[PDB]
Design a protein around this ligand. Structure first.
Ligand SMILES: O=C(O)C[C@@H](NC(=O)c1cccc2ncnn12)c1ccc(F)cc1F
Length: 167
């Protein structure tokens, strides 16, 4: 038993809600919150900009030190950093950004990172301003992640569309 509330059960392990991931994090303080990052950990907009703003830019400061030491992530890759005031840890996951011309096949690899954590609060990878088909992303999530994932979908119309079309 965990402390997530009001989530629609989709499969044995995936749950979904129309909510802001920052507010869910502030309420639940999960072990792991997922950021929809880019390879440079430059947290400008969407999920990343919102999470970073909620940490008062501490996420960005930590991220810049990570990149200075380790270099960029791979598309499809991830790193574990602090969750600051929002969670114990933040799993920064790089899904493909279709608006950058990145390869959508890498979405499955991106979701595989979730399997290293027993429970996660996460956004829908590569949705929104990342330019991928959100129905497809949800299918890949359910068909790839085996650990317990709680998805927070920000856009109400998107949430309604995802629920109504889910197989
Ligand atoms: O509407 C959506 O859920 C899709 C969209 N979400 C957000 O931008 C967002 C902004 C602030 C709080 C918040 N909580 C949950 N999502 N979310 C999105 C997802 C992945 C991505 F890589 C880029 C995106 F733009």
């Amino acid at each position: 038993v965990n402390s997530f509330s009001g989530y629609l059960k989709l499969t044995d392990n995936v749950y979904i809600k129309n909510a802001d991931i920052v507010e869910e994090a502030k309420k639940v303080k999960p072990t792991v919150v997922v950021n929809a990052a880019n390879v440079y950990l430059k947290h400008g907009g969407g999920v990343a900009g919102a999470l970073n703003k909620a940490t008062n830019n501490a996420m960005q400061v930590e991220s810049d030190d990570y990149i200075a030491t380790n270099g960029p992530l791979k598309v499809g890759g991830s790193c574990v950093l602090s969750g600051h005031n929002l969670a114990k840890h933040c799993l920064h996951v790089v899904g493909p950004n279709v608006n950058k011309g990145e390869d959508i096949q890498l979405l499955k690899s991106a979701y595989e990172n979730f399997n290293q954590h027993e429970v996660l609060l996460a956004p829908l990878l590569s949705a929104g301003i990342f330019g991928a088909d959100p129905i497809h992303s949800l299918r890949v999530c359910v068909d790839t992640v085996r650990t317990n994932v709680y998805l927070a979908v920000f856009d109400k119309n998107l949430y309604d569309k995802l629920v109504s079309s889910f197989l």
